[PDB]
Design a protein around this ligand. Structure first.
Ligand SMILES: O=C(O)c1cc(=O)[nH]c(=O)[nH]1
Ligand SMILES: O=C(O)c1cc(=O)[nH]c(=O)[nH]1
Lengths: 213, 207
């Protein structure tokens, strides 16, 4: 993996976003690890998070005109990623996010920020079943914009309800590329680096054997 | 004024956040100027916005444990302010925001002395609702920080900021005030007509 990807795993572990134990996922599966991006819940965590998103985005080489974050979890992510693109990559990008219902006052509709136009980069944390993307895609399409990509923190690389993963479902359903800062493959690689992580390594590898794509 | 205040006025003008013309405010008053923080809508705008909020916060000296932004406008403001505190002031603050439709909170636990951040205060509705939430969690209100204090009357004798300050015994601070805007416009010969209109508005509605 690239250095920033190893650093991102180290960051997620340090802020207790990446945890090990016995978790029940939205699907009902029992997983030995869980990535709870909601625990990036301080200003330093947000600052670094945006920097890691921005690095992954620039690394991908995908061209885009605007960053969109879905209400609610996407709003801080899009904000900090936009800041980091300006502060650390000499890129001053429009951002946008939605409100779940229109205000009484004014004609802003359901959008906040810049006009929703051009090639949109959608930011998200972890795709489980694609619902936040679906709501977002309906908004992107209704505004005449296109989806340049979806940028997420972690691709768990595991089956959805059927044969393909949730990320592969989004890629097919919305005909797009999903960019991830890290994957399950990267997590497994990181866990090979120190003997203290060997129990977690075995558990995560067993999970991949059962559910990985 | 302080350098960050002059720079914030210049920046707001350059991004059309501060604009002149004829606007109808939430109060129905016809104002010759309007401050729309929602037009700080690019990454550079957001980066600098948070710096300006962070500078006003540290300048105030108010002690606080957590930054809260009311949904929706306060969410990006609190986010970028928290980023700038960490990146430019070596201060790593918990942040929080609510879901407007109303569990109802995102971010760090709502505890301790909370600094609210908002764009403007018109009637005090976002603060009233946010204060309900903050006090219901046992937290206290360290302050409210806004971009611009328009220094105008509310429905009665006092301003909406003064209502907030008294109703909640809390401190409201602002990056800039109308008095700062007037001081700046007095320096710019090309803004003389705008200045006159703003001064006439202040004569009618100023507190
Ligand atoms: O429910 C899941 O599958 C899930 C959600 C989430 O936020 N993080 C994770 O690692 N899995
Ligand atoms: O009074 C208002 O409605 C108001 C004034 C202003 O300058 N900005 C804003 O957002 N609202």
């Amino acid at each position: 993996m690239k250095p920033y990807q190893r650093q991102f795993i180290e960051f997620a572990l340090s802020k207790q976003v990446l945890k090990f134990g016995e978790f029940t996922l939205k699907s009902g599966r029992k997983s030995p690890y869980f990535f709870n991006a909601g625990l990036f819940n301080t200003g330093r965590d947000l600052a670094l998070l945006g920097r890691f998103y921005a690095e992954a985005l620039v690394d991908s080489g995908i061209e885009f005109d605007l960053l969109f974050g879905p209400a609610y979890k996407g709003i801080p992510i899009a904000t900090t990623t936009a800041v980091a693109l300006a502060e650390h990559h000499d890129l001053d990008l429009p951002y946008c996010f939605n409100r779940k219902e229109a205000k009484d006052h004014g004609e802003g509709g359901n959008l906040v920020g810049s006009a929703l136009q051009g090639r949109v980069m959608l930011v998200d944390d972890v795709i489980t079943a694609g619902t936040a993307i679906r709501e977002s895609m309906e908004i992107i399409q209704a505004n005449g914009a296109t989806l340049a990509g979806v940028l997420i923190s972690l691709d768990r690389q595991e089956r959805g309800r059927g044969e393909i993963s949730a990320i592969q479902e989004v890629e097919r359903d919305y005909n797009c590329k999903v960019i991830s800062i890290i994957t399950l493959k990267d997590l497994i690689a990181y866990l090979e680096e120190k003997p203290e992580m060997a129990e977690h390594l075995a558990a995560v590898k067993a999970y991949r054997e059962e559910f990985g794509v």
